[PDB]
Design a protein around this ligand. Structure first.
Ligand SMILES: [Cl-]
Length: 159
């Protein structure tokens, strides 16, 4: 979807997931934007409802919840976790991060930029383009959130 719409949908759940886990707010958002293509990747349930699974987290035997089966083209079938909300999805994502001791420094970073350093040290992605893209995403999100905040107060002084 449009970047502004994506940010509007995911900002609050990422903030709440950040409070729960310690993972920086805009790091979660940046990874979600980056990996879903600002929501262009949609993973729907069989009846068309959203799965809210923005990261594309696969359903395996360690998942107790609902799943959705996506078949892509040779033909290939994959199972994804189904969530009831973006908040549940991002909460599950930072829990998965939290569960892995190698990413401890991510859960104690004070800024998104520090969090991105921590991910890179932990070896989150081997392709060095991922860290470059994440750095740029974090910068873009900072500018966007500034712009939103000014739309709010610029508007309020209508009245
Ligand atoms: Cl995918």
């Amino acid at each position: 979807m449009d970047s502004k719409d994506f940010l509007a949908r995911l900002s609050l759940p990422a903030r709440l997931a950040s409070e729960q886990s310690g993972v920086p707010h805009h790091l979660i958002l940046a990874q979600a934007a980056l990996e879903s293509g600002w929501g262009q990747r949609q993973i729907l349930r069989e009846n068309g409802e959203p799965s809210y699974n923005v990261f594309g987290v696969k359903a395996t035997a360690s998942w107790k919840g609902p799943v959705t089966e996506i078949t892509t083209t040779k033909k290939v079938k994959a199972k994804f976790r189904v969530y009831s909300s973006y908040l549940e999805a991002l909460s599950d994502y930072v829990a998965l991060l939290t569960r892995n001791p190698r990413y401890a420094a991510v859960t104690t970073a004070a800024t998104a930029e520090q969090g991105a350093v921590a991910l890179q040290n932990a070896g989150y992605a081997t392709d060095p383009n991922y860290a470059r893209k994440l750095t740029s995403m974090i910068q873009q999100l900072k500018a966007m959130s500034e712009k939103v905040s000014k739309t709010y107060s610029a508007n309020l002084d209508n009245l």
